[PDB]
Structures are given as C-alpha cells and as structure tokens.
Amino acid sequence: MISLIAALAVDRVAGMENAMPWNLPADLAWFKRNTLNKPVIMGRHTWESIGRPLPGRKNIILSSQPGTDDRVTWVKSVDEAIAACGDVPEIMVIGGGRVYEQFLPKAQKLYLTHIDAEVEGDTHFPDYEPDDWESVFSEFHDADAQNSHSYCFEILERR
Numbered sequence: 001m002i003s004l005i006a007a008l009a010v011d012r013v014a015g016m017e018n019a020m021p022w023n024l025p026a027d028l029a030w031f032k033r034n035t036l037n038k039p040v041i042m043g044r045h046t047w048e049s050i051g052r053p054l055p056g057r058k059n060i061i062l063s064s065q066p067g068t069d070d071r072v073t074w075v076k077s078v079d080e081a082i083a084a085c086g087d088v089p090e091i092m093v094i095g096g097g098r099v100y101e102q103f104l105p106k107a108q109k110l111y112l113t114h115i116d117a118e119v120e121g122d123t124h125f126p127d128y129e130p131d132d133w134e135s136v137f138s139e140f141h142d143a144d145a146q147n148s149h150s151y152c153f154e155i156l157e158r159r
Ligand SMILES: NC(=O)c1ccc[n+]([C@@H]2O[C@H](COP(=O)([O-])OP(=O)(O)OC[C@H]3O[C@@H](n4cnc5c(N)ncnc54)[C@H](OP(=O)(O)O)[C@@H]3O)[C@@H](O)[C@H]2O)c1
Pocket: 005, 006, 007, 008, 013, 014, 015, 016, 017, 018, 019, 020, 042, 043, 044, 045, 046, 047, 049, 062, 063, 064, 065, 075, 076, 077, 078, 094, 095, 096, 097, 098, 099, 100, 102, 123
C-alpha cells in the first residue's frame, strides 16, 4: 500500500520558503518511527531541504532530470517511483506539496501531525474528505519545554 506522511499546520499549511517555524522533536521522532525500514518517495525540493539521505530507508527522489547524488535513487515519474520500491508492504510518500497531490489518489493511509500553529505558507497538504477516511488512531500532545506547539498525531485509512 501507499501511505502519505506530513505535518500540517492550520489550513493544511505544510511548507514555506524556509524551514517551518516550529521545534517539534516529538513529531520528528514519529516521522522516523513510521518511515524507518520502508521506501520513502520525495520530490527534489524536499530532498534538498532534508540535505542528506534519510538513514535506514530506501530514498527515492522524483526529478525530471538525471540525479545529482549517487547515494539515492532518482526517478522521473510516479509509476517509476512505485516500481523502484519493489515488493514491500508499505511505501511512504514524504512530500512535498507537488508530490503529495500526485500520490494522494493512490494512497490507502495517511499519517498526519496536526500542529496548532496559525501560520502562512506557500505549500499545502492536498484536500482530503474525512468521510472517505476512517480515523484509526489519534494522540494529542500539548506544547512543552521541548516542543514549541501542540501537536496531534492521526492515522487515517481509506474506506
Ligand atoms: N510539512 C511536511 O510534512 C513537509 C514534508 C515535505 C516537504 N515539506 C515542504 O514542502 C516544500 C516542498 O514542496 P514542493 O511542492 O515545493 O516540492 P517537492 O514536491 O518536494 O518537489 C518538487 C519537485 O519534484 C519533482 N517532481 C515532482 N513530481 C514529479 C514527477 N511526476 N515527475 C518528475 N519530477 C517530479 C520535480 O523536480 P524537477 O524540478 O527536478 O523536475 C519538482 O520540481 C518545502 O517547503 C518543504 O519544506 C513539508
């Protein structure tokens, strides 16, 4: 199956010109936890933002051009990306906006972190219809000494 994972501020804002204005180590731990040992598909901008291969995962980067880093796998279409993942239980799509919109119709599961941050950005998570998804897990966390905002983890499965 194909899954998306993302951190969403209010209005599904997912990305800005620069790094998001929050310190959320617990969310990064959730991200690692749910992606380790699985192929991860990302767009070139997200690859550049991360700045290195994510360890312990097969990193697959979408770009229309040949790759510029031989440590990771580079593909030029959604179907090539999927094929490059091989026979695995779960493919993780980790963004960014362009990539999320392409994969959402193919996806069976969403891993979302809802962040109580009323911020502005240039990249959003695609619209999804709550009636087409069953929420199977939810977990709230307040802001604390190590996390700048309150965050709520959710897992949704497509009906
Ligand atoms: N809040 C979160 O959880 C989260 C997660 C990931 C990223 N982000 C944020 O998202 C932003 C990036 O999103 P974005 O939409 O700008 O970029 P993106 O989706 O990361 O990358 C876009 C690039 O991917 C390539 N691409 C996408 N689809 C393709 C296809 N079908 N065939 C070939 N190439 C394809 C293209 O590369 P070429 O131009 O080389 O052809 C394209 O320019 C950043 O601000 C980042 O911080 C947020």
